[PDB]
């Protein structure tokens, strides 16, 4: 246990190829095939983990508490929004739909399984701008007992190539650890636009971000009881790949009253 000095590079485990080798993606940007230390609890090498790597060798040497690499943090109490269900006047049908598709599935999955319906794993609050799309979710976070990891859309994209899919996987891992949890990717129309330019670096990175989001959302099994919410002002400018069963199915339709 000497390689575990304290310069180290955080990596993300991707695929266990053998008993003593793995495919990690160092934060420097490029993937490696490295030898895993024979002391780690190999039962913890879940995909998209937050393992550490030796500086110049990249040999996997330590697994981290998977709630550590997160640049995005679970909303605590200092940022607890100060609106209430009572404050949100109207939107009775919208309130009922979001409650039955977000809160109730979090609380009672056994009823959903026994009845026979498929529990929703995604909502797409949409409508004309200025209709309470953000505020209804804001009121939900003021009453939920579950983690409310709040990402902000365009926050995903950065100059550093590979700081995208990496942080998407990290956010979803953080959501899966603190289950039950609600992700609130906001203004998703900036990430999931339809038209695409396969020649510039701008679109070829947002593409990887969207692909990682889609793959992680498809990876949702029947368990892990984590729901995804995103809001948009323009529903048409949205990739149709985000409107399929297993992905966002329930669609709330905030109308100009």
């Amino acid at each position: 246990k000497r390689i575990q000095s304290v310069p180290l590079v955080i990596g993300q485990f991707l695929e266990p190829i053998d008993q003593n080798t793995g495919i990690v993606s160092s934060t420097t940007g490029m993937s490696y095939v490295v030898r895993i230390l024979s002391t780690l609890d190999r039962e913890l090498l879940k995909p998209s983990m937050s393992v550490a790597l030796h500086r110049h060798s990249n040999a996997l040497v330590d697994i981290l508490p998977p709630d550590s690499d997160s640049s995005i943090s679970v909303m605590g109490e200092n940022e607890k929004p100060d609106v209430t269900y009572a404050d949100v006047g109207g939107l009775d049908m919208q309130k009922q739909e979001i409650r039955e598709a977000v809160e109730l599935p979090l609380v009672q999955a056994d009823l959903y399984e026994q009845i026979g319906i498929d529990p929703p794993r995604g909502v797409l609050l949409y409508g004309p701008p200025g209709t309470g799309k953000t505020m209804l979710v804001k009121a939900v976070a003021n009453s939920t007992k579950a983690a409310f990891i709040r990402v902000n859309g365009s926050e995903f994209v950065h100059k550093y190539l590979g700081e995208g899919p990496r942080m998407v996987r990290d956010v979803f891992r953080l959501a899966r650890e603190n289950a039950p949890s609600i992700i609130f990717i906001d203004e998703v129309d900036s990430i999931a636009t339809k038209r695409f330019d396969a020649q510039t670096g701008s679109d070829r990175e947002v593409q990887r971000i969207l692909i990682e989001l889609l793959t992680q959302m498809d990876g949702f099994d029947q368990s892990t009881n984590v729901k995804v919410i995103m809001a948009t002002n323009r529903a048409d400018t949205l990739d149709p790949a985000l409107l399929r069963p297993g992905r966002l199915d329930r669609k709330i339709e905030f109308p100009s009253l």
Binding site: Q114, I115, G116, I117
Partner: protein, 51 residues
């Protein structure tokens, strides 16, 4: 529509009352159902809706 090109033009008319009953029965074998639900009555009430 020129002959020689795409061949068979197959019609999917909006389902009739029997077709609606069959579809409701097929999609109703996925949830806990109370005994003796007259699905034929519900489909007969369901007019215009399709698939």
């Amino acid at each position: 529509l020129r002959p020689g090109r795409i061949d068979r033009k197959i019609e999917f008319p909006p389902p009739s009352v029997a077709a609606r009953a069959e579809i409701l029965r097929i999609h109703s074998r996925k949830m806990n159902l109370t005994r003796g639900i007259n699905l034929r009555k519900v489909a007969e009430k369901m007019n215009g809706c399709s698939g």
